[PDB]
Amino acid sequence: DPIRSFCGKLRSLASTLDCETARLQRALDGEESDFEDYPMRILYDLHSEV
Amino acid sequence: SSDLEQLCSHVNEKIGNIKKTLSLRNCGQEPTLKTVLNKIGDEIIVINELLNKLELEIQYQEQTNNSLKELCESLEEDYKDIEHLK
Amino acid sequence: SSDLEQLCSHVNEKIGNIKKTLSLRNCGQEPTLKTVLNKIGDEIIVINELLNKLELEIQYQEQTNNSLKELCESLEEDY
Amino acid sequence: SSDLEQLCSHVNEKIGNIKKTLSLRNCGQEPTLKTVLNKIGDEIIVINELLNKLELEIQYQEQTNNSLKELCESLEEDYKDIEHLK
Numbered sequence A: 001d002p003i004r005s006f007c008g009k010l011r012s013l014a015s016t017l018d019c020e021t022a023r024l025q026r027a028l029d030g031e032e033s034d035f036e037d038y039p040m041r042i043l044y045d046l047h048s049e050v
Numbered sequence B, D: 001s002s003d004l005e006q007l008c009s010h011v012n013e014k015i016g017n018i019k020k021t022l023s024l025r026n027c028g029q030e031p032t033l034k035t036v037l038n039k040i041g042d043e044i045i046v047i048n049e050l051l052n053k054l055e056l057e058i059q060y061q062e063q064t065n066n067s068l069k070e071l072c073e074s075l076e077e078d079y080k081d082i083e084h085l086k
Numbered sequence C: 001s002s003d004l005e006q007l008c009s010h011v012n013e014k015i016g017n018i019k020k021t022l023s024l025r026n027c028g029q030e031p032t033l034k035t036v037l038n039k040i041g042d043e044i045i046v047i048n049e050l051l052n053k054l055e056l057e058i059q060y061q062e063q064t065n066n067s068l069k070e071l072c073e074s075l076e077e078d079y
Helices: A002-029 A034-049 B003-029 B031-085 C003-029 C031-075 D003-029 D031-065 D067-074 D076-084
Strands: none
Touching: A002 A034, A002 B003, A002 C003, A002 D003, A034 B003, A034 B031, B003 B031, B003 C003, C003 C031, D003 D031, D031 D067, D067 D076
16 A cells, blocks of 8 residues: 555656657657647637637 | 655646647747648738728717617607697 | 655554564563563562551651650640 | 645556556466566575575584584593693
8 A cells, every 4th residue: 555655656757757758759859740730620720710 | 745746746847848848849830830820810810800890880880870860850850740730 | 744754654663663573572582681671570579568668657657746746735734 | 635636646546556457467367477477486486495404404503513512521521631641
């Protein structure tokens, strides 16, 4: 219990550090697609509103 | 609060702050976004002129609305004087 | 308080709980402690008897103190 | 303590609890792990027998070590005899 309860929190901070450093590099590089795909989709919604 | 939590927030801030400076780069460089951004920006200029037209059209509507009423006192005045004859 | 702190306290409790069960083993097995512990325990039995003696000695002390008054009043009568 | 934080912890717990039940599945099914797990488990059995041997070897040591004294006091009574017989 209290052994993992701590680590679980710590772990998530890791998993997060893992995942986001990965993608943010890709994003910087022009891969990963989520970063040019979604801002499109919300910009196009914003357009559709206007 | 805790030293742990305070760290996380330090991280999310760095993470989030990148993501923002990321979208700033994307939207200001990548062409497909940059058009849809100008297309909105242009369509703001027109939807702005459409306001000025709606502003004047509201005004002449007003000006007409009173002229209709000052017309209305006139034909409602002389209905009273023929009705006294009849 | 925090998941971190809560862990520490879990640890100190395990650590501390050992150290206690440690001293319990030491004091009940190791001879040099075990004597000094009986030496105290014996010297409690004597310092207990020394109380009973002090109890009676107080009792008669109080017995004689009022007998001593029983005199001092009687002299103050004839004067 | 916030409703937000409490949610996160609910999430991490679900996430973490999977990851554990994940490793439990992997380690009990996937062969490459399952060998290295038996290799350790077997090497525990041997390192356990190596203890019993070290136990007796200590014990057969401890027992010839007082017998180094029994032969120490017997060759001592002989020494005081060069004092007396010389």
